[PDB]
Design a protein around this nucleic acid. Structure first.
Lengths: 77, 76, 76, 77
DNA sequence: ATGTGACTTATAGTCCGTGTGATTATAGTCAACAT
DNA sequence: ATGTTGACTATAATCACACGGACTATAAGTCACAT
């Protein structure tokens, strides 16, 4: 599938667990379905920037902070 | 509209220019539609990550450079 | 404790008595433990439907007759 | 498995739909797990009088009218 | 060249439900001794 | 006869998650016509 997606997918989960959230909490605060949060983490779904933005707000994290961890995950071995 | 969306778009336009590309050529290079691109640059589109990825390929810019730039752009 | 659970227990005891049964006999007839039965009637047990069902069979009473009674008891 | 159980589980669903509720509303209002409401209807499951009571409160229905519909369902052919 | 508009078609995102391993609270069942 | 106190062990009930189908909103991709 897509390189960037699974990275975006990975980072959303990583943060979520770092903050001791559950998918239920997250989909809560992101005002998306808990099915969608699952869908994203599970099968790296192809979300929209707007949806990503909602998730960032849900993770109680900033644009910047997210993208900084995104860059880190991309760079890894 | 969205704050992020506008700066993604701004960034896309910034890079296209710093490189000296036309929209026509960014569309060709990324195998997407020119009106599609025009839309994004006037910020009338809400890309998916996949699309963004294709535009990065077209701009010939790695994900990292794009995001390094987007961050800087984000901080006024 | 619970209102319903109390009325259920009361009903179980009521029917046992109008039939002149002992607890010992109610437990023999439904193959459950006598201390188990005791416990319900002193309202110290929160039984499951399955258990309730075994007790109805031990009381020789249909589900319907039981609930008809339980409703009436519920209404003071 | 159990005669009465599938009757109880049938009636919980009947009411739930009659009141235009979804499972996960009822799971909230009944102050029980999401998956328990499913599990009760889905298969049958052997609930407790206390849990049944919670569900009745959740269906926004009285002990009495629940049991009245229970009786009616038992009596069917 | 770029910017519209408007018009399909793919798919992102929603909504309601099923099914499941793992853990925790508690009912199910049965001792010993009471009265 | 019934009551009560511990117990052990089955299972009710919880919690975090995956997975599917069907439906709705909207992004993806392509026309025509501006400039």
């Amino acid at each position: 599938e897509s390189f960037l997606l699974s990275k975006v997918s990975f980072v959303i989960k990583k943060i979520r667990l770092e903050k001791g959230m559950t998918q239920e909490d997250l989909a809560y605060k992101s005002n998306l379905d808990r099915t969608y949060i699952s869908g994203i983490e599970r099968n790296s779904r192809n979300l929209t920037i707007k949806s990503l933005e909602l998730i960032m707000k849900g993770l109680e994290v900033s644009d910047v902070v997210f993208f900084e961890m995104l860059i880190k995950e991309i760079l890894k071995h």
